[PDB]
Curated annotation (Swiss-Prot), chain C:
The gene is S. It comes from the Viruses. Changing residue 18 to E: In strain: Isolate GD03. The KxHxx motif seems to function as an ER retrieval and binds COPI in vitro. Fusion peptide 1 (FP1) and fusion peptide 2 (FP2) function cooperatively and have a membrane-ordering effect on lipid headgroups and shallow hydrophobic regions of target bilayers. They are considered as two domains of an extended, bipartite FP. The membrane-ordering activity is calcium-dependent and also dependent on correct folding, which is maintained by an internal disulfide bond in FP2. This is Spike glycoprotein. It comes from Severe acute respiratory syndrome coronavirus (SARS-CoV). The cytoplasmic Cys-rich domain is palmitoylated. Spike glycoprotein is digested by cathepsin CTSL within endosomes.
Amino acid sequence: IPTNFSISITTEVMPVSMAKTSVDCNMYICGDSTECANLLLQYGSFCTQLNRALSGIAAEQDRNTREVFAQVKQMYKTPTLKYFGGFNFSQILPDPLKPTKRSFIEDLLFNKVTLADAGFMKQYGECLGDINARDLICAQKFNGLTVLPPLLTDDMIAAYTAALVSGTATAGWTFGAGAALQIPFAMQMAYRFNGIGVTQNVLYENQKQIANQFNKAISQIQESLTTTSTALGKLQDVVNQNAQALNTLVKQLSSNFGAISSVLNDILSRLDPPEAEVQIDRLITGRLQSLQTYVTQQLIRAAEIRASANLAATKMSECVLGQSKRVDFCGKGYHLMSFPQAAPHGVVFLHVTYVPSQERNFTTAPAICHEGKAYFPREGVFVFNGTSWFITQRNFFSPQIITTDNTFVSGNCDVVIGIINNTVYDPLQPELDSFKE
Amino acid sequence: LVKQLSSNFGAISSVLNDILSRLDPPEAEVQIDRLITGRLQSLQTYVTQQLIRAAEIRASANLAATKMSECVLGQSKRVDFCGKGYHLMSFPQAAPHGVVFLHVTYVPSQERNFTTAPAICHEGKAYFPREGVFVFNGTSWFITQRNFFSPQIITTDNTFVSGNCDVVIGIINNTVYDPLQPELDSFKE
Amino acid sequence: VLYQDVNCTDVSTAIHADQLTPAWRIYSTGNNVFQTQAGCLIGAEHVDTSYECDIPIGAGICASYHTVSQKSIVAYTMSLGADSSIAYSNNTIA
């Protein structure tokens, strides 16, 4: 039976969105040759079906992002105290004095994985900047590969994360059910511990210790996010896969598919138009095959990202919006709490798990026959017996005397293998003896 | 797929029986091979798209089967999985190439502000509440449930014994009731 | 019009000087709006209100069909959610 607990906080990073890419086949296929379009239009809707598929992928990514982040109805305002029952919620909620509207943990996450393969950003073409600061600048390239910005901006994602954290800390575990039942954080933690099986005694009598352990775990998470290693790299791997796909597409664009040269506007100045039409058709076929391979790989990656986003949304609905009895699903041990955090093209959950420690071996007993009838324990499943002494809980020691309220009546003693003779206590007989006599 | 069927892939025409009787058989074999290659590429693309769509539909069907096994065949304590709030029931319905469930969820009603009570020390020992943790109190009056009001008298059957009163922060001093003492005083005395 | 990726400055010049490839005969231009990945939404007024996202466009600027003075297409900030007044209290139970 463990005697002391150890509040730990684990991290879990799951991508929910990918790079919304859009490749224009008008510039990729038939870059600058005006005679190339006459042969390109001969094929058909190869430039329309791929654009439709890419638009569908973008819509699916936007819908997955909305289903993952946007789950609450009302936007709960972030509290100004950020200190509930001893639990210091700093570096989690947006600071009212910080210039940025994000959190410290959110800033540390956005300052690690947002490298985006520094040096390869000029492969595609986008429009970086914001409308507020008037720093929006559009950039294009001759390859025609473009990346569409996501629907939900980073500010909206940070606002959704702040609303989720506020609904988890304040209003208890009800903002996901459909109402807002305000309740202090102390009773919330009491219910969180009761859902596991531990009574409110360990929660209330050791509230300061739990708050100190929570603050220590938060500080350890901050120190791990400050200086880190190859860990926390799912989003980085997704970005690297997208960059490698774009680089392979660009390389296959400038590749000779069994023709005179891989560069346009050169075979027309050295060969006859009817003779160069064959080479143009071969180059167009090779480019179309490369683009079809790219579209298939993008479809596979989009299906994978959609599955990961559905899994992350399920985890957020089960761990954040309540207390799930799922074993090794939210964190490592008992869930007991959850806190979501924003991340670039992903979600980083903070599972405040419950890990017991300081175990000690003790003798037990299946049943206790007092006066011919056995007494199986009702609530406390562990019959902690030095020499047939007490009855305790499962996850915490909590030494408590054995009474008739913790055990029920049963049959004889010759039916249980391991019956131990002991006396059961009842507050009725001494009280009656003191009242009458 | 139909449009790519009636479409040229770099040949004389996209309709059969036309390129045959206009050139020599060896010259038409090249065009026939080009058309066959184009048709094979289009059909391979169609088969790949069908495989992707079949994988997606299989994933959705597995999710729907899990939802039916968890919500219809029993009562799952999942949060925001079957319906909006508490599942409490589920009814499946037939649909063309799909399943439409009818989750009879439980939604709360208008609320009311009350006063909290972490613990109650009657005679030096604190009495923490039972499974029902929301202790409704005007001024340290009663104890209630978590979802419905259900006003109930605070007795010894809804609380248990614990340590002293200086271990829990926010404990409100109040008196506890036990049905044994009045009955004994009425019977004996 | 929703021109995917442009500065919405050369497109207007190409339209006014007949330099764009898609040349609609019955087409005019009265007002252009520029946001992050705008699309040069010619026809909609950049209203400073906040309505529910009906037609998602991108970068948090959706479109819909509401009344202006009357029925016209507008642009808003998706109206992320209605504000709440749930305040924490260590002595209040709901």
